[PDB]
Amino acid sequence: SGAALACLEKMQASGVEEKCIHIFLIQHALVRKGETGYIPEKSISPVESLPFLQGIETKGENTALLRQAVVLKLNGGLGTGMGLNGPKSLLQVKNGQTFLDFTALQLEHFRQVRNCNVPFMLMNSFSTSGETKNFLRKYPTLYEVFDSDIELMQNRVPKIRQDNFFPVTYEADPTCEWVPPGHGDVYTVLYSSGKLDYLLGKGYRYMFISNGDNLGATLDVRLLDYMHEKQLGFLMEVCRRTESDKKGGHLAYKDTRRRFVLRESAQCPKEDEDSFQNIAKHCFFNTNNIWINLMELKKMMDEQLGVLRLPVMRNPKTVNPQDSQSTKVYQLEVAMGAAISLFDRSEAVVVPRERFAPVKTCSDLLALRSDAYQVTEDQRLVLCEERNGKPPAIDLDGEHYKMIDGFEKLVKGGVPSLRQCTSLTVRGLVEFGADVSVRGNVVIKNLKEEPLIIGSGRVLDNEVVVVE
Numbered sequence: 001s002g003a004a005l006a007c008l009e010k011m012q013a014s015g016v017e018e019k020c021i022h023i024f025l026i027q028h029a030l031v032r033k034g035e036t037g038y039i040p041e042k043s044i045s046p047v048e049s050l051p052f053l054q055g056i057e058t059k060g061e062n063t064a065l066l067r068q069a070v071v072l073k074l075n076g077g078l079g080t081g082m083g084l085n086g087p088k089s090l091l092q093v094k095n096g097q098t099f100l101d102f103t104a105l106q107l108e109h110f111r112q113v114r115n116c117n118v119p120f121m122l123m124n125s126f127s128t129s130g131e132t133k134n135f136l137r138k139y140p141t142l143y144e145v146f147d148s149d150i151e152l153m154q155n156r157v158p159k160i161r162q163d164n165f166f167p168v169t170y171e172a173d174p175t176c177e178w179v180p181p182g183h184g185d186v187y188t189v190l191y192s193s194g195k196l197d198y199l200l201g202k203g204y205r206y207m208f209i210s211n212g213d214n215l216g217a218t219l220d221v222r223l224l225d226y227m228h229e230k231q232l233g234f235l236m237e238v239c240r241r242t243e244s245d246k247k248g249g250h251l252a253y254k255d256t257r258r259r260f261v262l263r264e265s266a267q268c269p270k271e272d273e274d275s276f277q278n279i280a281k282h283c284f285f286n287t288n289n290i291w292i293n294l295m296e297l298k299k300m301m302d303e304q305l306g307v308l309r310l311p312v313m314r315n316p317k318t319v320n321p322q323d324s325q326s327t328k329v330y331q332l333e334v335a336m337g338a339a340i341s342l343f344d345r346s347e348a349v350v351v352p353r354e355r356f357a358p359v360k361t362c363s364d365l366l367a368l369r370s371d372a373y374q375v376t377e378d379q380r381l382v383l384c385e386e387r388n389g390k391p392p393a394i395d396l397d398g399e400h401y402k403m404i405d406g407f408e409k410l411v412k413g414g415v416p417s418l419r420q421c422t423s424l425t426v427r428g429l430v431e432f433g434a435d436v437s438v439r440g441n442v443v444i445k446n447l448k449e450e451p452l453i454i455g456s457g458r459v460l461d462n463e464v465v466v467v468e
């Protein structure tokens with residue numbers, strides 16, 4: 001393959017890790033022959049039941065295990081879905097505090113309260129590393145050990161043309177020619193960097209990993225205790241899916257014994273969107289709060305010669321995400337949750353919603369920035385009590401609010417109160433002013449060209465607003 005050799009040479013020219021190149025060209029072979037990465041509804045069965053955290057946990061903690069624990073926050077994605085060209089963690093959340101402020105403050109609270117200097121890492125990509133490093137100047141505790149201790153630099157892979165599978169060229173911005181290969185990349189990065197051997201040599205055996213956008217994620221020593229007692233290599237936290245869980249992955253089963261499967265958004269064929277979005281059928285949603293046993297990982301990686309068989313997802317895009325007329329490409333990516341079938345002993349457990357405040361979209365961001373979410377003593381962000389575990393279901397017009405620039409007009413004059421909101425749908429150009437209270441099920445449709453301004457102090461109480 002001339003296309004594979006072209007990818008090979010371009011990767012080697014940019015300093016890409018040898019095993020990553022090898023794993024990529026494996027996937028490249030597959031996709032060149034029309035591998036879609038899809039998990040069709042007819043290939044899987046729903047997960048009907050799972051153990052709950054209240055059941056499986058006990059009183060008391062084994063502090064000896066916490067002493068073996070290490071935290072990693074994922075920070076490598078490009079946030080292209082929200083129209084970013086860099087780290088979504090540098091987005092403001094509350095009080096002029098970004099996602100990364102909340103992460104740094106959470107860690108500091110954890111270390112203080114428990115008097116335990118738990119190791120901490122951020123998995124960065126080429127697109128997020130520099131901005132993240134400079135941001136952390138504000139946290140000298142982290143900054144002074146950023147290169148040596150904190151950063152885990154993941155790999156990058158070229159975007160490849162949908163027609164001939166060659167790496168794409170984009171002269172206007174050669175930066176658009178590359179993508180981090182998914183958070184699934186973590187295992188090979190840990191292995192090939194020497195970080196895994198380093199951590200194991202200091203006696204660490206467990207790693208807690210969560211999304212950089214999820215400020216609800218918590219190191220639970222009682223869940224750690226459980227994972228260890230059942231001698232698990234991998235534990236995934238899931239939530240009872242809500243109407244707001246539209247993007248990410250749900251669990252399912254495949255057969256002749258049953259094994260877990262993770263079906264991501266990118267693995268769902270167009271014809272199956274309705275099923276993928278049936279929250280009652282596919283009711284267990286991955287939080288991406290994942291515990292791994294590091295020695296089990298080490299043993300697997302050695303066994304499989306640095307090459308985990310994670311399922312490749314073949315993500316179609318344009319080379320410049322913002323320009324729909326730019327060259328059509330495929331991003332080959334893996335998800336860290338897909339290791340759930342690869343570990344010898346793995347489990348998923350249902351956790352309370354207060355451990356999962358995701359921001360995948362500007363609709364999610366709206367909910368987080370609003371009074372629907374609250375800061376806890378331990379510096380987490382958690383859904384308010386009166387929403388009874390169910391985030392407001394926010395549908396923001398994809399033609400106006402998908403890009404952060406468009407979302408910016410909506411909240412420019414004010415983030416509305418959403419703590420009493422079960423549902424908010426916005427269509428056309430719309431602009432909130434100050435101290436707007438949204439209550440119950442609210443619809444706002446503007447059919448005029450002029451933005452619809454929602455006056456300051458307006459109460460929208462189970463109301464449908466249509467301006468024409």
Ligand SMILES: O=c1ccn([C@@H]2O[C@H](COP(=O)(O)OP(=O)(O)O[C@H]3O[C@H](CO)[C@@H](O)[C@H](O)[C@H]3O)[C@@H](O)[C@H]2O)c(=O)[nH]1
Binds near residue numbers: 077247336337
């Ligand atoms: O190559 C990459 C790609 C993403 N990220 C980071 O990974 C985290 C999550 O990525 P994101 O695109 O926000 O989420 P998805 O990958 O679509 O979904 C994940 O998060 C959902 C929970 O919000 C789960 O339901 C999914 O199964 C899980 O794969 C964020 O910190 C990203 O910055 C990386 O570090 N490297």
